[PDB]
Amino acid sequence: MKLILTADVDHLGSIGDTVEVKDGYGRNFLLPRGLAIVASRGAQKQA
RNA sequence: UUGCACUACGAGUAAAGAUGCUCGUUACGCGCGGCAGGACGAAAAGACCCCGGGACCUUCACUACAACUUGGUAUUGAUGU
Ligand SMILES: [Mg+2]
Ligand SMILES: [Mg+2]
Ligand SMILES: [Mg+2]
Ligand SMILES: [Mg+2]
Ligand SMILES: [Mg+2]
Ligand SMILES: [Mg+2]
Ligand SMILES: [Mg+2]
Ligand SMILES: [Mg+2]
Ligand SMILES: [Mg+2]
Ligand SMILES: [Mg+2]
Ligand SMILES: [Mg+2]
């Protein structure tokens, strides 16, 4: 899965851009803390 | 317990140890109290032995499995070297 990261994550990306992580990092650190969301419909909102 | 029954003995004979067959011998019929030699007495389809089956036990019999244990992979991520 691909996460659009709303927060700024060091050596991982800035606001808004989409970045793919190895699925444990995302669901155990990024989604719980609001750093990223899963990319389903957010591309239209960003663009 | 019981196939019967007016169920002797000897020497024989016979599935090789005979109340029941042979040849002899002995013995009136029926009870009662005793004895325990025989009726291969009774009792338990011999525990021995063998054959077939079983059971449980053992183990460096076989094949499995539990348990224990090994690594891979999922759960499972980040950063450096
Ligand atoms: Mg995964
Ligand atoms: Mg008599
Ligand atoms: Mg005789
Ligand atoms: Mg005789
Ligand atoms: Mg006769
Ligand atoms: Mg008598
Ligand atoms: Mg006797
Ligand atoms: Mg007997
Ligand atoms: Mg028998
Ligand atoms: Mg052993
Ligand atoms: Mg293991």
From Swiss-Prot:
List all disulphide bridges recorded for this chain: none
The domain of life for this entry's organism is: Bacteria
What protein family does this chain belong to? Belongs to the bacterial ribosomal protein bL9 family.
Free-text function comment from the UniProt entry: Binds to the 23S rRNA.
Instruction: Please give the name of this protein.
Output: Large ribosomal subunit protein bL9
Give the species this sequence originates from: Mycobacterium bovis (strain BCG / Pasteur 1173P2)
